[PDB]
Structures are given as C-alpha cells and as structure tokens.
Design a protein around this ligand. Sequence first.
Ligand SMILES: COc1ccc(C[C@H]2C(=O)Nc3ccccc3C(=O)N2C)cc1
Ligand SMILES: COc1ccc(C[C@H]2C(=O)Nc3ccccc3C(=O)N2C)cc1
Ligand SMILES: O=C(O)CCC(=O)C(=O)O
Ligand SMILES: O=C(O)CCC(=O)C(=O)O
Ligand code: NI
Ligand code: NI
Lengths: 288, 288
Amino acid sequence: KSQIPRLSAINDLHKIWPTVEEHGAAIIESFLSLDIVRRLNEEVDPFVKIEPIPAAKTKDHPNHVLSTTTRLVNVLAPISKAYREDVLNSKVLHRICSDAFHVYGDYWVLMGAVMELAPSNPAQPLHRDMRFSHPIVEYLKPDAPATSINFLVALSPFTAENGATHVILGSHKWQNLSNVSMDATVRALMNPGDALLITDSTIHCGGAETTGTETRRLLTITMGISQLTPLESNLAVPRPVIESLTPLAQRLLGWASQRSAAPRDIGLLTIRGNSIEKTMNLKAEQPL
Amino acid sequence: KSQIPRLSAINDLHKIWPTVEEHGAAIIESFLSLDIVRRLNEEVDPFVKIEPIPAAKTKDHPNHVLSTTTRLVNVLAPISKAYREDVLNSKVLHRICSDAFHVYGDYWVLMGAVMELAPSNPAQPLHRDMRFSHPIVEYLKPDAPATSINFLVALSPFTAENGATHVILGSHKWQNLSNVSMDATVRALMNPGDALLITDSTIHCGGAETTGTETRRLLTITMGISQLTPLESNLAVPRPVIESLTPLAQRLLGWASQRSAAPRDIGLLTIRGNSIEKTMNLKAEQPL
Ligand SMILES: COc1ccc(C[C@H]2C(=O)Nc3ccccc3C(=O)N2C)cc1
Ligand SMILES: COc1ccc(C[C@H]2C(=O)Nc3ccccc3C(=O)N2C)cc1
Ligand SMILES: O=C(O)CCC(=O)C(=O)O
Ligand SMILES: O=C(O)CCC(=O)C(=O)O
Ligand code: NI
Ligand code: NI
C-alpha cells in the first residue's frame, strides 16, 4: 500500500495543502530547521519535566483520555521564544493555513503543545481529533472544508519501533467507520523538524513505544478557523510578552479581533465596531 | 395563519425551549421586569446617543449590513449594572440555554447588544443570523441542534406600525428557501420586557418604522455554545468590573474556561490542565 506523501517545505509549498486535502496526510520535510527544534527543546525542557499526569487530581480540567505516560504542556508563548517568534510566524505554516481555511476566513491556534511520551508508552486507539472538546464538528456536512488541521512536528526521531504516528490515508473522507483497523495504517517516519500534517477528519493514532528506552517528543499545532474556540487560553500571558509579538502572532493567540470570509464580514471579538488591538492600544514587536 | 406562541416566564418555563424548537419562535412575556428594563435603559442611554453609524469610517470593524438609522452598542457589562447582574444571571435565560445547548455543553454570550432604530428605519430583508460572522454554521447538517439562539428583548413597545420584528414560523426547519416571502411572516407584538426568542435558523427581519415619530429599542442577546467564538470581546473590561460578577456571568463573558458535553471532556480555554479563573486567581462577587 501507498506511503504518506513527502513534501519539501522549501520547494513544494503550494502542493502541501492540496496533497493533504486529497490524501488526508502529508509529511513536510524540514518544516522547522534543526536550530529552531534545538531552541524549542531547550526552552520547553523544564516545563515538560515538571508536568504531572494528564489527569492529575490537582487539575481543574483533567485530561482523562491521554495515557499516564504522556506529558503535554500547552500555552507555549510565555515559555518559548522560538515558539512565539519563529513557529508562530512560520511562512510555511501560514501559506498552508490560508490555503486550507480561505472558505471560512481568519484562523488561529486552537492548541500549541509539546507532547512527550515516556518509554513503553502504549499505542493510542485510532481516532479523529476534536471529539473531546468540539462536539459541534461531528455535526458538519461531509463536504464541509476542514475547520481545523494538526501539525505534528517531530522534536525527536519518529521510528516504527519507538511509536511513530499511524494514519489511514483517505480516511478524512470516510463516512462509514467499519474499515477502521491498524491493518489500514501507514507510519509517519520522521526526523526532528519534519512535520506530519493531518486534518480533523484524518483517522490516526500515536504508536506503541516498544524499546523501553526511547523518549519521543512532538510539537502538536492544531490550527483552526477563528470561529471555533481554542482548547487553550493565552489570557494570562503577560502583556510584555504579548507586546513583543508580531501582530500576526498576537491574532493567533486571541489577542486580536478576527474576521470571517463573508463578503460583508462583521467580525469576531470586536468592541462596538473596533478591534481589541485598537481599543486596548496594544503594541507589537516591542523587544523584551 | 398561526401567531407566535406566547409563554409565561413565571409559569411556562419548561415549555419555552420545546416551543421554540418546534415552531422556531416564541414570545416570553415579562422576560425582564419593568424595573430591570428601566435601569437597563437609563444605563445604556448615553452610549446609544454617542454611537455613530454602523459603518462609520472611524471603525476598525465596520458593520456594512445594518441600516444607517441603526445604533447598536455591544460589550454592555462595563456600561450596565442591570445587564451584568440581573440579565446575565437570569434564571429564565439559563434554563432555556441549558435546555437548548445540552447536547453540545457550555454556552456563553456571543453578543449582548442594545439596538435602537431611528424613526423611519426601513424593514430589513428576511434573513438568518450568523451568516456575516460564522460561515461555519451554514455547513452544519439540517438535524444539528441549534448552536446559537437570540433573545430579542423589547426595551420599548413593538407595534405593527413602528417596526415590530417579523418571523416565519417553522422556517428554522426549512432547507429550500424559495417560499421566503413577507407574505409568510407574523409579527412579534411586544410590551417592554417581553422577549422574542428565535434560533440561528429562524428566518426573520426587523420591521418598517412607518410613523416617522417612534424610536424602537431592543436588547438582543445571542447565546451560543462555548465552542463558537463570540462576535464581541470582553478582554478590555476592567478587572474590578469582572470580579464584581458571579462566576456564571464571568463564564458567559469569556472570563472563565469552558466545557463541552463529551463524556471525557478535555475543555476549552484551559491552561495546562487548569482553568483561567484558577490560574489568574480571579475573584467573584466583589462589590464595587
Ligand atoms: C489515548 O487515546 C486518545 C484518544 C483520542 C485522542 C484525541 C485527542 C484530541 O482530540 N486532541 C488532541 C490534540 C493534540 C494533543 C492531544 C489531544 C488530546 O488530548 N486528545 C484527547 C487522544 C488520545
Ligand atoms: C439590513 O439587513 C440585515 C441582514 C442581516 C442581518 C443579520 C445580522 C446578524 O447576522 N446578526 C446580528 C444579530 C444581532 C444584531 C445585529 C446583527 C447583525 O449585525 N447582522 C448583520 C442584519 C441586517
Ligand atoms: O503521539 C502521536 O504521535 C499522536 C498523538 C495524537 O494523535 C493525540 O494525542 O491526539
Ligand atoms: O430589528 C429587529 O427587530 C430585528 C433585528 C435583526 O434581526 C438583526 O439585526 O439581525
Ligand atoms: Ni490525535
Ligand atoms: Ni437578525
């Protein structure tokens, strides 16, 4: 059977979204440079080491779904200069997202998280994303363009034996889910900096860590239309951090008003006809 | 033909949502007391007098749809004690919204606005709400439960001659929109404090002001599932105002995390497994 299409972030930029739209998945080789991966890893390191189990009893909003051997840390902007500067302003990411979401309008970050899987982390069941947070998405017509997409960026090697993600190609177009089987999957074998791009309808799962020694880490960036509420909030991010960002990054984090693609769009998160950023006199690109 | 069903806010509470679900519209008599209407009117008065045309050239997010004789002012919490206290904690509103949105989960305010129509304001074309802000809603399956509803609360008399709202009963279930005609409408004749309740699929329009003397005013409260982004932002509302609110009102204004109805819900606007309100040590019901 056919493998996940592989594309250049440098040369094949216009081909990436059409490839995902057709096949449900694509690998973007060198989506992030090794320099960015390195800085990103350094910056998030301590925060993933301190992270408790997904369903820690201390938590207000425990995640009862992820395995106990998963450490997920979101709201990365205050943690990581590399994230808030380099990845939030990624030319490749923005071309793909504008290609993907043009029918709907503005898009933003639903969740940017670093996920680290401990050695011996088990395979997840095959699933579609968004079903534990956005029940609305299940009620969309089958030809509705994808309302969110997920960049699964390797921050360490993804191998068959260490739990590289499985996808079922074409499954983003499936309505009958009885052919759902691990027999139908292929793997996203990836180097650090490569990214697996899927839609919210692509059937996929984390793989089984079978070595007992390897710790796999990824940066998962769920980008979605600005009409859907983010899984994560940047409301508590300090204003000096927000004001150091580009206007585009501020929009991505919910620190700007948003626009739909309707011809006479009336906007989202507006304040009596004016934007958040105008109203609050929000500055941009102020060095820290 | 049949008129809009009329219901008591006091006695018929459990019947209101079932009535709207069936007919697409209902009138809730005395939804707000005359005392609340009075205080609300006093408090918003100056702000509607200062409001420029919907598409004022000074505006970041001009509304090119509403007539030039419309004054709409949203983000009412900092303007009105009556709004932020009495209407945001309305027992009737919350019973209806929990009835309406239980399949999806938490709901919040998409927009709370005072609309005032000048004398001679023309009839709006027949329409469904949400199409200039949430293109996603058009892609929902026809049996998808309503994802937003709109309380059109009379703040002055609604009469046939002064432009009382038109609705087409049953039109929330229409898929073919070729029977759309003013011939198919009935009017929401209402006293101050009464409310017309419609869904996002109910076909309706503002009426023609034919007297040349009467100024009609309403409070429009679009309540929607917390998975959809509000038309308006409360990000710039001062913290002392927010901290004077009940926890429920804070949630309604986007100053709290939110939950979906998925069995193992992972939540919306969360911060690494904890809520906004826990993270920011947000107080509630602190008198000003
Ligand atoms: C163990 O079995 C699972 C079943 C389903 C899921 C889906 C997933 C989701 O819908 N969104 C994301 C996206 C990025 C990172 C994590 C998640 C996340 O928490 N869940 C639950 C995860 C695990
Ligand atoms: C003049 O013709 C019109 C055509 C359509 C509309 C729809 C409406 C909407 O979708 N949502 C609301 C809801 C509450 C108050 C105002 C509005 C608002 O601005 N529009 C555009 C209004 C006017
Ligand atoms: O671990 C992976 O590679 C996939 C994780 C995933 O799909 C999820 O948690 O939603
Ligand atoms: O003026 C009215 O009564 C209805 C207004 C309305 O439906 C709208 O502006 O969306
Ligand atoms: Ni997943
Ligand atoms: Ni309307």
